Every structure is written in structure tokens, then in C-alpha cells.
Structure 1
Amino acid sequence: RQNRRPELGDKFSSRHGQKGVCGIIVKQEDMPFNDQGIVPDIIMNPHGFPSRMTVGKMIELISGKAGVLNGTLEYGTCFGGSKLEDMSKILVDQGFNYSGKDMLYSGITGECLQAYIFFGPIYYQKLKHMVLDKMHARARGPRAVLTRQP
């Protein structure tokens, strides 16, 4: 038995087919932060959604933010599910943006961002293929009995 902390290199997923190697682990003060103090956990660059056309993640989050604010789990099914137009109204009744796109400050320098940030919770499952049982190195090791190669 052994356990481990998720350091960089490991393979995270997004349940819609967006793989990712953990790039770098930074300290807590450097990320952005909203009006209430929420630090975002995991940051994705926006260079996937035009090419991969993964609009479902963009609809996962609008139904994602609205559910735990209302305190009820929400049904996103196939060929239907929780609609969008009645899901924006419960977000705006609390004070947040109507398209989920809240504003943020910068944790590095202290002021606002010139643009707004799409924001909230996404379901991230961890995946296999962690790195410490793939790190490999052989200096001067065994040779085969027949042809004497490594």
C-alpha cells in the first residue's frame, strides 16, 4: 500500500475528452480571486473550445453554478435535460452574471483584469498513467543471453 500527492506530470481529464498534463503547481496567493474570496482550483487555457467544439462543457458550467447556489442537483440528460433560459434566472436572482461570466482581480499585481473570466465548478475526474511508475533510466544494466543487446 502507498499513497501520493498529485504533483505535476499526472493526467487529469474533464469527462468530455480534454486530456491534460499538470503543467506547474503554484502557491495560493498568485491565482485570481473574486469579490467573496474564492480561489479557483484548476485553470484551463481557452485554446480548446474553438477547435474541439466542446460546447457541452460550456453548458455544464452554466447548469453547474446554478445548482449548488439553489442547493439542488440538476438533470443534464441526453437529447434534452435542464434548459438554459430558466437556468440563467436563478443565477441572476443572487447577484452573479447572467452568462456565468463573473469578474476577477489579479493575485499577482492586485488590480482588475481588462477582460472577464468564465467561472465556476467543473467535474474533474483523475485518470491513470501517473508518472512515478513511468520514470525509467538504465545506465549499464542487463544484456540478453543470445544477442547481448539491452
Structure 2
Amino acid sequence: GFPSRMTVGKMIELISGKAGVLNGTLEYGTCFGGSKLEDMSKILVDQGFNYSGKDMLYSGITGECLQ
């Protein structure tokens, strides 16, 4: 649903959301500003996670990793 619709700001909702839950602060996604993408991936990288939100999933019906 992303290339035909070009809603990449939704992609910034997870990165500024997943790194907003961790250090207990509800973030700001206001127009022409808000949380910068550079210092929200810095909060997310020193908690032990990926800077870009990509986690590796162990599959559910077969148990092996996902490629």
C-alpha cells in the first residue's frame, strides 16, 4: 500500500512511536516540524534496537527465521 499511495510519513509514525514508548515521552508529529528523524533513531539504537525499526521475526507456524 506504500508505493502506490506514497505515505512515507506513516513510516515516521513508527520510528517516532517505537522510540517514544521506551523513554516514557509521547512524541510530537506536528506539521513542518515535530520530532526529527535523526535524534529519534538515536534514542532507539542505544536501547538495543535497530535504528530503522527493522526487527527480525521468528515465524509462527514453522518456527524458523524470516529471510
Q: Which has the higher helix share?
A: 2
Q: Distance in 2 between matches of 1:70 and 1:104?
A: 23
1:80 positional shift: 1.0
1:50 positional shift: 0.5
For structure 2, which runs of at least 5 residues remain unmatched after alignment? none
For structure 1, which runs of at least 5 residues remain unmatched after alignment? 1-47, 113-150
1:72 positional shift: 0.6
CA root-mean-square deviation:
0.6
Q: Which has the higher strand share?
A: 1
The structure 1 segments of at least 4 consecutive aligned residues displaced by more than 3 Å after TM superposition are none
Q: Distance in 2 between matches of 1:107 and 1:67?
A: 27
Counterpart of 1:86 (choices 18, 39, 44) is 39
Question: What SS does the corresponding residue of 1:62 show, helix, strand or coil?
Answer: helix
Question: What SS does the corresponding residue of 2:63 show, helix, strand or coil?
Answer: coil
The answer as to 2:55 corresponding to 1:67 is no
CA-to-aligned-CA distance 1:107-136 (integer Å, 9 cap, x gap): 000000xxxxxxxxxxxxxxxxxxxxxxxx
Q: Name which structure has the greater RCO, CA cutoff 8 Å, separation 6+.
A: 1
Question: What SS does the corresponding residue of 1:106 show, helix, strand or coil?
Answer: coil
Q: Distance in 2 between matches of 1:82 and 1:94?
A: 18
Q: Distance in 2 between matches of 1:85 and 1:94?
A: 15
1:56 positional shift: 1.1
Normalising to structure 1: TM-score of the pair?
0.43
Question: What SS does the corresponding residue of 1:49 show, helix, strand or coil?
Answer: coil
Normalising to structure 2: TM-score of the pair?
0.93
Q: Distance in 2 between matches of 1:81 and 1:90?
A: 15
Q: Which has the larger radius of gyration?
A: 1
Question: What SS does the corresponding residue of 2:22 show, helix, strand or coil?
Answer: helix
Identity of aligned residues (%): 100
Paired residues, number? 65
Corresponding residue of 1:99: 52
Q: Distance in 1 between matches of 2:53 and 2:21?
A: 13
